[PDB]
PDB file of all heavy atoms in Angstrom:
ATOM      1  N   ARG A   1       0.791  -1.247   0.027  1.00  0.00           N
ATOM      2  CA  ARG A   1      -0.023   0.004   0.019  1.00  0.00           C
ATOM      3  C   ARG A   1       0.838   1.273   0.026  1.00  0.00           C
ATOM      4  O   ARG A   1       0.537   2.249   0.665  1.00  0.00           O
ATOM      5  CB  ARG A   1      -0.968  -0.027   1.170  1.00  0.00           C
ATOM      6  CG  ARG A   1      -2.047  -1.128   1.078  1.00  0.00           C
ATOM      7  CD  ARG A   1      -2.948  -0.876  -0.033  1.00  0.00           C
ATOM      8  NE  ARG A   1      -4.139  -1.752  -0.018  1.00  0.00           N
ATOM      9  CZ  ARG A   1      -4.150  -2.987  -0.476  1.00  0.00           C
ATOM     10  NH1 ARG A   1      -3.054  -3.529  -1.097  1.00  0.00           N
ATOM     11  NH2 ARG A   1      -5.239  -3.759  -0.448  1.00  0.00           N
ATOM     12  N   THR A   2       1.955   1.258  -0.780  1.00  0.00           N
ATOM     13  CA  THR A   2       2.790   2.413  -1.014  1.00  0.00           C
ATOM     14  C   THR A   2       2.761   2.856  -2.482  1.00  0.00           C
ATOM     15  O   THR A   2       3.353   3.855  -2.834  1.00  0.00           O
ATOM     16  CB  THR A   2       4.224   2.224  -0.527  1.00  0.00           C
ATOM     17  OG1 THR A   2       4.807   1.260  -1.356  1.00  0.00           O
ATOM     18  CG2 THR A   2       4.261   1.770   0.901  1.00  0.00           C
ATOM     19  N   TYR A   3       2.158   2.048  -3.360  1.00  0.00           N
ATOM     20  CA  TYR A   3       2.194   2.388  -4.770  1.00  0.00           C
ATOM     21  C   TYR A   3       1.517   3.731  -5.022  1.00  0.00           C
ATOM     22  O   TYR A   3       0.531   4.092  -4.413  1.00  0.00           O
ATOM     23  CB  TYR A   3       1.446   1.328  -5.552  1.00  0.00           C
ATOM     24  CG  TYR A   3       1.184   1.714  -7.002  1.00  0.00           C
ATOM     25  CD1 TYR A   3       1.994   1.232  -8.052  1.00  0.00           C
ATOM     26  CD2 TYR A   3       0.088   2.471  -7.356  1.00  0.00           C
ATOM     27  CE1 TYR A   3       1.812   1.583  -9.332  1.00  0.00           C
ATOM     28  CE2 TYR A   3      -0.148   2.778  -8.701  1.00  0.00           C
ATOM     29  CZ  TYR A   3       0.690   2.322  -9.710  1.00  0.00           C
ATOM     30  OH  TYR A   3       0.510   2.598 -10.975  1.00  0.00           O
ATOM     31  N   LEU A   4       2.178   4.532  -5.891  1.00  0.00           N
ATOM     32  CA  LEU A   4       1.650   5.764  -6.342  1.00  0.00           C
ATOM     33  C   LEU A   4       2.057   5.972  -7.769  1.00  0.00           C
ATOM     34  O   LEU A   4       3.242   5.910  -8.111  1.00  0.00           O
ATOM     35  CB  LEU A   4       2.266   6.983  -5.418  1.00  0.00           C
ATOM     36  CG  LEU A   4       2.034   8.366  -5.919  1.00  0.00           C
ATOM     37  CD1 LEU A   4       0.673   8.922  -5.590  1.00  0.00           C
ATOM     38  CD2 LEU A   4       3.093   9.287  -5.289  1.00  0.00           C
ATOM     39  N   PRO A   5       1.088   6.272  -8.641  1.00  0.00           N
ATOM     40  CA  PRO A   5       1.465   6.363 -10.103  1.00  0.00           C
ATOM     41  C   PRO A   5       2.391   7.579 -10.316  1.00  0.00           C
ATOM     42  O   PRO A   5       2.243   8.643  -9.692  1.00  0.00           O
ATOM     43  CB  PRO A   5       0.113   6.591 -10.832  1.00  0.00           C
ATOM     44  CG  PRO A   5      -0.815   6.864  -9.679  1.00  0.00           C
ATOM     45  CD  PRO A   5      -0.396   6.274  -8.455  1.00  0.00           C
ATOM     46  N   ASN A   6       3.236   7.438 -11.326  1.00  0.00           N
ATOM     47  CA  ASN A   6       4.136   8.506 -11.749  1.00  0.00           C
ATOM     48  C   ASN A   6       3.324   9.519 -12.510  1.00  0.00           C
ATOM     49  O   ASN A   6       2.311   9.286 -13.124  1.00  0.00           O
ATOM     50  CB  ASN A   6       5.297   7.940 -12.501  1.00  0.00           C
ATOM     51  CG  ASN A   6       5.935   6.734 -11.936  1.00  0.00           C
ATOM     52  OD1 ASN A   6       6.613   6.839 -10.906  1.00  0.00           O
ATOM     53  ND2 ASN A   6       5.738   5.529 -12.473  1.00  0.00           N
ATOM     54  N   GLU A   7       3.829  10.775 -12.450  1.00  0.00           N
ATOM     55  CA  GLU A   7       3.265  11.844 -13.269  1.00  0.00           C
ATOM     56  C   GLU A   7       2.995  11.477 -14.673  1.00  0.00           C
ATOM     57  O   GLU A   7       3.873  10.804 -15.254  1.00  0.00           O
ATOM     58  CB  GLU A   7       4.087  13.103 -13.157  1.00  0.00           C
ATOM     59  CG  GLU A   7       3.522  14.320 -13.902  1.00  0.00           C
ATOM     60  CD  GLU A   7       2.435  15.000 -13.055  1.00  0.00           C
ATOM     61  OE1 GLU A   7       2.116  14.580 -11.921  1.00  0.00           O
ATOM     62  OE2 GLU A   7       1.859  15.982 -13.528  1.00  0.00           O
ATOM     63  N   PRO A   8       1.834  11.804 -15.182  1.00  0.00           N
ATOM     64  CA  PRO A   8       1.556  11.474 -16.588  1.00  0.00           C
ATOM     65  C   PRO A   8       2.070  12.661 -17.480  1.00  0.00           C
ATOM     66  O   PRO A   8       2.297  13.838 -17.014  1.00  0.00           O
ATOM     67  CB  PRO A   8       0.091  11.345 -16.674  1.00  0.00           C
ATOM     68  CG  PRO A   8      -0.469  12.355 -15.582  1.00  0.00           C
ATOM     69  CD  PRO A   8       0.571  12.244 -14.506  1.00  0.00           C
ATOM     70  N   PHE A   9       2.209  12.374 -18.787  1.00  0.00           N
ATOM     71  CA  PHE A   9       2.445  13.422 -19.727  1.00  0.00           C
ATOM     72  C   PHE A   9       1.155  14.217 -19.994  1.00  0.00           C
ATOM     73  O   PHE A   9       0.182  13.640 -20.282  1.00  0.00           O
ATOM     74  CB  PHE A   9       2.934  12.841 -21.084  1.00  0.00           C
ATOM     75  CG  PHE A   9       3.553  13.934 -21.926  1.00  0.00           C
ATOM     76  CD1 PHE A   9       4.752  14.545 -21.644  1.00  0.00           C
ATOM     77  CD2 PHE A   9       2.909  14.268 -23.118  1.00  0.00           C
ATOM     78  CE1 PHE A   9       5.274  15.484 -22.517  1.00  0.00           C
ATOM     79  CE2 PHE A   9       3.461  15.207 -24.013  1.00  0.00           C
ATOM     80  CZ  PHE A   9       4.635  15.833 -23.669  1.00  0.00           C
ATOM     81  N   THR A  10       1.299  15.552 -19.899  1.00  0.00           N
ATOM     82  CA  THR A  10       0.103  16.397 -19.947  1.00  0.00           C
ATOM     83  C   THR A  10       0.382  17.485 -21.001  1.00  0.00           C
ATOM     84  O   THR A  10       1.376  18.214 -20.857  1.00  0.00           O
ATOM     85  CB  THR A  10      -0.283  17.015 -18.615  1.00  0.00           C
ATOM     86  OG1 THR A  10      -0.088  16.044 -17.585  1.00  0.00           O
ATOM     87  CG2 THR A  10      -1.612  17.571 -18.585  1.00  0.00           C
ATOM     88  N   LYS A  11      -0.454  17.574 -22.014  1.00  0.00           N
ATOM     89  CA  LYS A  11      -0.360  18.595 -23.002  1.00  0.00           C
ATOM     90  C   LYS A  11      -1.754  19.286 -23.047  1.00  0.00           C
ATOM     91  O   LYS A  11      -2.788  18.619 -23.065  1.00  0.00           O
ATOM     92  CB  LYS A  11      -0.034  18.075 -24.389  1.00  0.00           C
ATOM     93  CG  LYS A  11      -0.522  16.740 -24.736  1.00  0.00           C
ATOM     94  CD  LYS A  11       0.146  16.104 -25.882  1.00  0.00           C
ATOM     95  CE  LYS A  11       0.374  16.957 -27.093  1.00  0.00           C
ATOM     96  NZ  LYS A  11       0.523  16.280 -28.385  1.00  0.00           N
ATOM     97  N   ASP A  12      -1.802  20.623 -23.035  1.00  0.00           N
ATOM     98  CA  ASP A  12      -3.034  21.394 -22.938  1.00  0.00           C
ATOM     99  C   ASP A  12      -3.378  21.715 -24.444  1.00  0.00           C
ATOM    100  O   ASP A  12      -2.728  22.530 -25.069  1.00  0.00           O
ATOM    101  CB  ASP A  12      -2.907  22.593 -22.151  1.00  0.00           C
ATOM    102  CG  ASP A  12      -2.349  22.327 -20.749  1.00  0.00           C
ATOM    103  OD1 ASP A  12      -2.269  21.180 -20.386  1.00  0.00           O
ATOM    104  OD2 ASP A  12      -1.872  23.264 -20.089  1.00  0.00           O
ATOM    105  N   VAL A  13      -4.478  21.109 -24.891  1.00  0.00           N
ATOM    106  CA  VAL A  13      -4.931  21.388 -26.260  1.00  0.00           C
ATOM    107  C   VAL A  13      -6.087  22.336 -26.184  1.00  0.00           C
ATOM    108  O   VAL A  13      -6.855  22.388 -25.242  1.00  0.00           O
ATOM    109  CB  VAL A  13      -5.439  20.036 -26.938  1.00  0.00           C
ATOM    110  CG1 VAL A  13      -4.358  19.009 -26.946  1.00  0.00           C
ATOM    111  CG2 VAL A  13      -6.727  19.581 -26.294  1.00  0.00           C
ATOM    112  N   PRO A  14      -6.174  23.303 -27.180  1.00  0.00           N
ATOM    113  CA  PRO A  14      -7.191  24.364 -27.142  1.00  0.00           C
ATOM    114  C   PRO A  14      -8.558  23.821 -27.747  1.00  0.00           C
ATOM    115  O   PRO A  14      -8.637  23.483 -28.943  1.00  0.00           O
ATOM    116  CB  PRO A  14      -6.601  25.459 -28.042  1.00  0.00           C
ATOM    117  CG  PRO A  14      -5.719  24.712 -29.024  1.00  0.00           C
ATOM    118  CD  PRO A  14      -5.297  23.405 -28.406  1.00  0.00           C
ATOM    119  N   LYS A  15      -9.515  23.713 -26.846  1.00  0.00           N
ATOM    120  CA  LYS A  15     -10.806  23.323 -27.312  1.00  0.00           C
ATOM    121  C   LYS A  15     -11.408  24.425 -28.238  1.00  0.00           C
ATOM    122  O   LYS A  15     -11.250  25.570 -27.908  1.00  0.00           O
ATOM    123  CB  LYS A  15     -11.767  23.036 -26.114  1.00  0.00           C
ATOM    124  CG  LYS A  15     -11.355  21.899 -25.274  1.00  0.00           C
ATOM    125  CD  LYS A  15     -12.355  21.578 -24.177  1.00  0.00           C
ATOM    126  CE  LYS A  15     -12.703  22.739 -23.308  1.00  0.00           C
ATOM    127  NZ  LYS A  15     -13.387  22.270 -22.019  1.00  0.00           N
ATOM    128  N   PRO A  16     -12.167  24.039 -29.282  1.00  0.00           N
ATOM    129  CA  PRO A  16     -12.670  25.036 -30.146  1.00  0.00           C
ATOM    130  C   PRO A  16     -13.591  26.096 -29.503  1.00  0.00           C
ATOM    131  O   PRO A  16     -13.586  27.283 -29.880  1.00  0.00           O
ATOM    132  CB  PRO A  16     -13.355  24.256 -31.271  1.00  0.00           C
ATOM    133  CG  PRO A  16     -12.828  22.914 -31.180  1.00  0.00           C
ATOM    134  CD  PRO A  16     -12.471  22.678 -29.747  1.00  0.00           C
ATOM    135  N   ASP A  17     -14.375  25.659 -28.448  1.00  0.00           N
ATOM    136  CA  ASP A  17     -15.206  26.514 -27.819  1.00  0.00           C
ATOM    137  C   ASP A  17     -14.472  27.620 -27.031  1.00  0.00           C
ATOM    138  O   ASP A  17     -15.115  28.448 -26.465  1.00  0.00           O
ATOM    139  CB  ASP A  17     -16.064  25.702 -26.794  1.00  0.00           C
ATOM    140  CG  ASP A  17     -15.184  24.910 -25.784  1.00  0.00           C
ATOM    141  OD1 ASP A  17     -13.995  25.083 -25.839  1.00  0.00           O
ATOM    142  OD2 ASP A  17     -15.778  24.072 -25.006  1.00  0.00           O
ATOM    143  N   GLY A  18     -13.150  27.605 -27.012  1.00  0.00           N
ATOM    144  CA  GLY A  18     -12.354  28.583 -26.253  1.00  0.00           C
ATOM    145  C   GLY A  18     -11.808  28.000 -24.963  1.00  0.00           C
ATOM    146  O   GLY A  18     -11.010  28.719 -24.309  1.00  0.00           O
ATOM    147  N   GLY A  19     -12.117  26.757 -24.638  1.00  0.00           N
ATOM    148  CA  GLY A  19     -11.601  26.161 -23.407  1.00  0.00           C
ATOM    149  C   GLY A  19     -10.336  25.393 -23.708  1.00  0.00           C
ATOM    150  O   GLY A  19      -9.721  25.494 -24.786  1.00  0.00           O
ATOM    151  N   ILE A  20      -9.866  24.644 -22.753  1.00  0.00           N
ATOM    152  CA  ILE A  20      -8.632  23.874 -22.789  1.00  0.00           C
ATOM    153  C   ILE A  20      -8.935  22.481 -22.338  1.00  0.00           C
ATOM    154  O   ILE A  20      -9.464  22.335 -21.184  1.00  0.00           O
ATOM    155  CB  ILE A  20      -7.516  24.508 -21.959  1.00  0.00           C
ATOM    156  CG1 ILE A  20      -6.184  23.988 -22.355  1.00  0.00           C
ATOM    157  CG2 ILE A  20      -7.753  24.343 -20.482  1.00  0.00           C
ATOM    158  CD1 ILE A  20      -5.550  24.573 -23.581  1.00  0.00           C
ATOM    159  N   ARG A  21      -8.528  21.553 -23.089  1.00  0.00           N
ATOM    160  CA  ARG A  21      -8.616  20.089 -22.668  1.00  0.00           C
ATOM    161  C   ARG A  21      -7.275  19.602 -22.296  1.00  0.00           C
ATOM    162  O   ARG A  21      -6.329  19.694 -23.190  1.00  0.00           O
ATOM    163  CB  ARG A  21      -9.301  19.230 -23.793  1.00  0.00           C
ATOM    164  CG  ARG A  21      -9.351  17.791 -23.397  1.00  0.00           C
ATOM    165  CD  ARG A  21     -10.612  16.995 -23.969  1.00  0.00           C
ATOM    166  NE  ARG A  21     -10.893  15.761 -23.326  1.00  0.00           N
ATOM    167  CZ  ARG A  21     -11.871  14.980 -23.603  1.00  0.00           C
ATOM    168  NH1 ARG A  21     -12.818  15.315 -24.463  1.00  0.00           N
ATOM    169  NH2 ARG A  21     -12.019  13.803 -22.928  1.00  0.00           N
ATOM    170  N   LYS A  22      -7.117  19.101 -21.116  1.00  0.00           N
ATOM    171  CA  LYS A  22      -5.807  18.665 -20.564  1.00  0.00           C
ATOM    172  C   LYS A  22      -5.677  17.183 -20.646  1.00  0.00           C
ATOM    173  O   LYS A  22      -6.263  16.486 -19.813  1.00  0.00           O
ATOM    174  CB  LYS A  22      -5.582  19.239 -19.182  1.00  0.00           C
ATOM    175  CG  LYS A  22      -4.171  19.282 -18.720  1.00  0.00           C
ATOM    176  CD  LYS A  22      -3.975  20.681 -17.970  1.00  0.00           C
ATOM    177  CE  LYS A  22      -4.679  20.699 -16.624  1.00  0.00           C
ATOM    178  NZ  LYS A  22      -4.409  21.987 -15.907  1.00  0.00           N
ATOM    179  N   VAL A  23      -5.025  16.697 -21.727  1.00  0.00           N
ATOM    180  CA  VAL A  23      -4.884  15.247 -21.871  1.00  0.00           C
ATOM    181  C   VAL A  23      -3.787  14.782 -20.978  1.00  0.00           C
ATOM    182  O   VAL A  23      -2.843  15.493 -20.660  1.00  0.00           O
ATOM    183  CB  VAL A  23      -4.697  14.809 -23.319  1.00  0.00           C
ATOM    184  CG1 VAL A  23      -3.396  15.591 -23.814  1.00  0.00           C
ATOM    185  CG2 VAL A  23      -4.494  13.347 -23.404  1.00  0.00           C
ATOM    186  N   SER A  24      -3.870  13.480 -20.500  1.00  0.00           N
ATOM    187  CA  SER A  24      -2.942  12.910 -19.624  1.00  0.00           C
ATOM    188  C   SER A  24      -2.545  11.529 -20.137  1.00  0.00           C
ATOM    189  O   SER A  24      -3.383  10.658 -20.309  1.00  0.00           O
ATOM    190  CB  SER A  24      -3.423  12.749 -18.142  1.00  0.00           C
ATOM    191  OG  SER A  24      -3.828  13.979 -17.622  1.00  0.00           O
ATOM    192  N   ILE A  25      -1.314  11.418 -20.479  1.00  0.00           N
ATOM    193  CA  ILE A  25      -0.713  10.144 -20.930  1.00  0.00           C
ATOM    194  C   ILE A  25       0.151   9.574 -19.823  1.00  0.00           C
ATOM    195  O   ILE A  25       1.231  10.038 -19.588  1.00  0.00           O
ATOM    196  CB  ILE A  25       0.137  10.288 -22.244  1.00  0.00           C
ATOM    197  CG1 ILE A  25      -0.672  11.051 -23.279  1.00  0.00           C
ATOM    198  CG2 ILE A  25       0.526   8.921 -22.790  1.00  0.00           C
ATOM    199  CD1 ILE A  25      -0.293  10.834 -24.706  1.00  0.00           C
ATOM    200  N   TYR A  26      -0.417   8.570 -19.124  1.00  0.00           N
ATOM    201  CA  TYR A  26       0.356   7.934 -18.040  1.00  0.00           C
ATOM    202  C   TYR A  26       1.385   7.031 -18.714  1.00  0.00           C
ATOM    203  O   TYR A  26       1.352   6.644 -19.831  1.00  0.00           O
ATOM    204  CB  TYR A  26      -0.511   7.089 -17.108  1.00  0.00           C
ATOM    205  CG  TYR A  26      -1.459   7.885 -16.179  1.00  0.00           C
ATOM    206  CD1 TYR A  26      -2.449   8.742 -16.631  1.00  0.00           C
ATOM    207  CD2 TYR A  26      -1.143   7.890 -14.830  1.00  0.00           C
ATOM    208  CE1 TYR A  26      -3.181   9.492 -15.775  1.00  0.00           C
ATOM    209  CE2 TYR A  26      -1.895   8.588 -13.911  1.00  0.00           C
ATOM    210  CZ  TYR A  26      -2.921   9.374 -14.387  1.00  0.00           C
ATOM    211  OH  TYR A  26      -3.635  10.133 -13.493  1.00  0.00           O
ATOM    212  N   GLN A  27       2.340   6.594 -17.868  1.00  0.00           N
ATOM    213  CA  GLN A  27       3.414   5.691 -18.329  1.00  0.00           C
ATOM    214  C   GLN A  27       2.777   4.301 -18.502  1.00  0.00           C
ATOM    215  O   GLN A  27       1.756   4.011 -17.991  1.00  0.00           O
ATOM    216  CB  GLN A  27       4.554   5.684 -17.400  1.00  0.00           C
ATOM    217  CG  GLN A  27       5.345   6.972 -17.336  1.00  0.00           C
ATOM    218  CD  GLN A  27       6.202   7.067 -16.108  1.00  0.00           C
ATOM    219  OE1 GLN A  27       6.714   6.070 -15.553  1.00  0.00           O
ATOM    220  NE2 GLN A  27       6.474   8.364 -15.672  1.00  0.00           N
ATOM    221  N   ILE A  28       3.452   3.486 -19.280  1.00  0.00           N
ATOM    222  CA  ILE A  28       2.872   2.132 -19.563  1.00  0.00           C
ATOM    223  C   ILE A  28       2.592   1.414 -18.313  1.00  0.00           C
ATOM    224  O   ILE A  28       1.501   0.767 -18.244  1.00  0.00           O
ATOM    225  CB  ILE A  28       3.841   1.383 -20.552  1.00  0.00           C
ATOM    226  CG1 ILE A  28       3.859   2.032 -21.880  1.00  0.00           C
ATOM    227  CG2 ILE A  28       3.502  -0.130 -20.598  1.00  0.00           C
ATOM    228  CD1 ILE A  28       5.156   1.894 -22.658  1.00  0.00           C
ATOM    229  N   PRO A  29       3.400   1.359 -17.329  1.00  0.00           N
ATOM    230  CA  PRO A  29       2.966   0.609 -16.096  1.00  0.00           C
ATOM    231  C   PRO A  29       1.746   1.141 -15.475  1.00  0.00           C
ATOM    232  O   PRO A  29       0.799   0.446 -15.192  1.00  0.00           O
ATOM    233  CB  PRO A  29       4.197   0.801 -15.165  1.00  0.00           C
ATOM    234  CG  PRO A  29       5.399   0.989 -16.070  1.00  0.00           C
ATOM    235  CD  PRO A  29       4.803   1.731 -17.285  1.00  0.00           C
ATOM    236  N   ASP A  30       1.679   2.429 -15.256  1.00  0.00           N
ATOM    237  CA  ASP A  30       0.450   3.055 -14.659  1.00  0.00           C
ATOM    238  C   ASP A  30      -0.761   2.886 -15.470  1.00  0.00           C
ATOM    239  O   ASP A  30      -1.853   2.637 -15.006  1.00  0.00           O
ATOM    240  CB  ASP A  30       0.655   4.526 -14.301  1.00  0.00           C
ATOM    241  CG  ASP A  30       2.156   4.778 -13.815  1.00  0.00           C
ATOM    242  OD1 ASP A  30       2.551   4.296 -12.823  1.00  0.00           O
ATOM    243  OD2 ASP A  30       2.820   5.552 -14.591  1.00  0.00           O
ATOM    244  N   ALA A  31      -0.625   3.042 -16.871  1.00  0.00           N
ATOM    245  CA  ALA A  31      -1.738   2.869 -17.713  1.00  0.00           C
ATOM    246  C   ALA A  31      -2.191   1.342 -17.650  1.00  0.00           C
ATOM    247  O   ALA A  31      -3.452   1.130 -17.619  1.00  0.00           O
ATOM    248  CB  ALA A  31      -1.316   3.210 -19.145  1.00  0.00           C
ATOM    249  N   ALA A  32      -1.305   0.439 -17.575  1.00  0.00           N
ATOM    250  CA  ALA A  32      -1.730  -0.973 -17.449  1.00  0.00           C
ATOM    251  C   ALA A  32      -2.419  -1.243 -16.159  1.00  0.00           C
ATOM    252  O   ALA A  32      -3.468  -1.958 -16.220  1.00  0.00           O
ATOM    253  CB  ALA A  32      -0.408  -1.852 -17.531  1.00  0.00           C
ATOM    254  N   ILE A  33      -1.907  -0.707 -15.062  1.00  0.00           N
ATOM    255  CA  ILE A  33      -2.607  -0.896 -13.706  1.00  0.00           C
ATOM    256  C   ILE A  33      -4.025  -0.224 -13.859  1.00  0.00           C
ATOM    257  O   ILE A  33      -4.972  -0.822 -13.332  1.00  0.00           O
ATOM    258  CB  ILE A  33      -1.726  -0.304 -12.656  1.00  0.00           C
ATOM    259  CG1 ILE A  33      -0.898  -1.403 -12.064  1.00  0.00           C
ATOM    260  CG2 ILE A  33      -2.624   0.236 -11.514  1.00  0.00           C
ATOM    261  CD1 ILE A  33       0.166  -1.935 -13.003  1.00  0.00           C
ATOM    262  N   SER A  34      -4.084   0.907 -14.416  1.00  0.00           N
ATOM    263  CA  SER A  34      -5.373   1.614 -14.553  1.00  0.00           C
ATOM    264  C   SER A  34      -6.385   0.730 -15.296  1.00  0.00           C
ATOM    265  O   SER A  34      -7.499   0.612 -14.862  1.00  0.00           O
ATOM    266  CB  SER A  34      -5.167   2.961 -15.237  1.00  0.00           C
ATOM    267  OG  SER A  34      -4.542   3.900 -14.421  1.00  0.00           O
TER     268      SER A  34
END
């Protein structure tokens, strides 16, 4: 009970409505566990 996922890759894409969608690409281990 010490596992903690590593920071994901985050790129802020501009939503056409004027907002921002923040995508998160976790690393392969954390994505697999998810």
Side-chain angles (χ1 to χ4, degrees):
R1 294 292 189 274
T2 68
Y3 170 96
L4 168 79
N6 311 291
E7 181 76 3
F9 196 70
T10 319
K11 33 198 316 203
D12 309 346
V13 305
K15 296 186 305 196
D17 56 7
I20 196 79
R21 178 144 197 179
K22 204 135 66 176
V23 57
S24 300
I25 310 205
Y26 284 69
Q27 295 163 28
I28 287 149
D30 326 293
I33 267 66
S34 290

